[PDB]
Amino acid sequence: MFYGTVSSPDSGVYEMKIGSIIFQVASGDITKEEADVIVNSTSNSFNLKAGVSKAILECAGQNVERECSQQAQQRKNDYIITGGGFLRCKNIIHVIGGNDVKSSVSSVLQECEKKNYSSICLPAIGTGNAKQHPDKVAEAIIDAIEDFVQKGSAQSVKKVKVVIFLPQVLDVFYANMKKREG
Numbered sequence: 001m002f003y004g005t006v007s008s009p010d011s012g013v014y015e016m017k018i019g020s021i022i023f024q025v026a027s028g029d030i031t032k033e034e035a036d037v038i039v040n041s042t043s044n045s046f047n048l049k050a051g052v053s054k055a056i057l058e059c060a061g062q063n064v065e066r067e068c069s070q071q072a073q074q075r076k077n078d079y080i081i082t083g084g085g086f087l088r089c090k091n092i093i094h095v096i097g098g099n100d101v102k103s104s105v106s107s108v109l110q111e112c113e114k115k116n117y118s119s120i121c122l123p124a125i126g127t128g129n130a131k132q133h134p135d136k137v138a139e140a141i142i143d144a145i146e147d148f149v150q151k152g153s154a155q156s157v158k159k160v161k162v163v164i165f166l167p168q169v170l171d172v173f174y175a176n177m178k179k180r181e182g
């Protein structure tokens with residue numbers, strides 16, 4: 001059930017179908033990507049600037065930084081949605097790196113359906129400052145997408161891409177895809 005075949009459409013990029021969704025992984029700088037939503041993996045204060053969060057907040061700009069701290073003071077949030085600033089996206093969804101990764105990805109998918117968005121790009125959530133294990137993170141991200149497909153929830157969402165800072169973490173994601181393939 002659900003899983004297609006792993007192939008490489010471009011050097012260093014690997015993909016497979018999960019239901020109707022194209023799931024892709026690659027190594028690189030996520031701030032150079034274009035997608036409807038880019039995901040940030042941050043602290044429970046939404047003001048971290050270390051690792052992926054440093055690159056995202058510096059490239060998005062000061063207006064996005066201020067939107068984050070404004071929402072953080074308003075209520076207790078599991079995640080926040082801001083504009084894209086100077087990134088090539090419509091919105092940034094800022095998730096907490098130390099939280100359950102399957103839950104965080106499920107929330108991102110649901111928010112993207114609510115906006116009728118088609119494409120998402122995320123980092124290896126939790127593997128930076130939060131120091132979650134890469135094998136557990138890969139299993140959680142792919143499980144969230146499988147659950148979303150099984151429930152019949154994929155309508156607008158067509159492409160989910162993980163852009164991963166360390167090539168060694170990319171290798172862990174690729175092995176998990178091969179374990180699942182049809």
Ligand SMILES: CC(=O)Nc1ccccc1O
Nearest residue numbers: 051052124127128129165
């Ligand atoms: C998960 C995470 O923070 N990754 C990352 C991305 C870019 C630079 C440094 C990094 O550690």
Ligand SMILES: [Cl-]
Nearest residue numbers: 097126128130
């Ligand atoms: Cl993290």
Ligand SMILES: [Cl-]
Nearest residue numbers: 123124164165
């Ligand atoms: Cl990453």
